[PDB]
Design a protein around this ligand. Sequence first.
Ligand code: HEM
Length: 148
Amino acid sequence: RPESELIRQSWRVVSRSPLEHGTVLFARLFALEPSLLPLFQYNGRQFSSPEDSLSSPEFLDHIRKVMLVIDAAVTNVEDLSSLEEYLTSLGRKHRAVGFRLSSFSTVGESLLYMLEKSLGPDFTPATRTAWSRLYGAVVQAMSRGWDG
Ligand code: HEM
């Protein structure tokens, strides 16, 4: 498929520096939906400001984890049913920490923002479309952790 290669070639650019790009994703995320900030509860404390999250080593590890799951999705872009059972339980885990299904779209928008900023003119509307579909497939799998 032409979509698969668009994903692989765009990801190649981002996967070079995953924390720097991930940090973009999350900064954007908290700008769009500040109420996601309290869900990160390392040492039973809440971040006061988005910038506090950026000084937490656990938070930065979580960014790395995010980027690793996306990398796995990219690698399996030709068949994402292989990740399905993992993504479902990943969904369940996030449901447990207090993530809401409706916040998936914010994460998606954040992902697209990060790609748009990173690729600039290379972020064509076909790249956009490809990534939306990839992201959608991921969310559909994770969503089964709410079962339904
Ligand atoms: C954007 C909102 C999200 C929030 C608020 C959030 C929050 C959390 C929290 C609180 C944990 C548990 C503590 C920790 O491991 O750092 C966690 C774990 C995790 N998150 Fe997220 N997360 C989000 C999104 C994502 C997304 C989109 C992915 C992947 C695509 C991701 C991948 C992971 C992974 C792999 C773990 C470790 C799960 C385990 O095996 O226990 N997270 N997340």
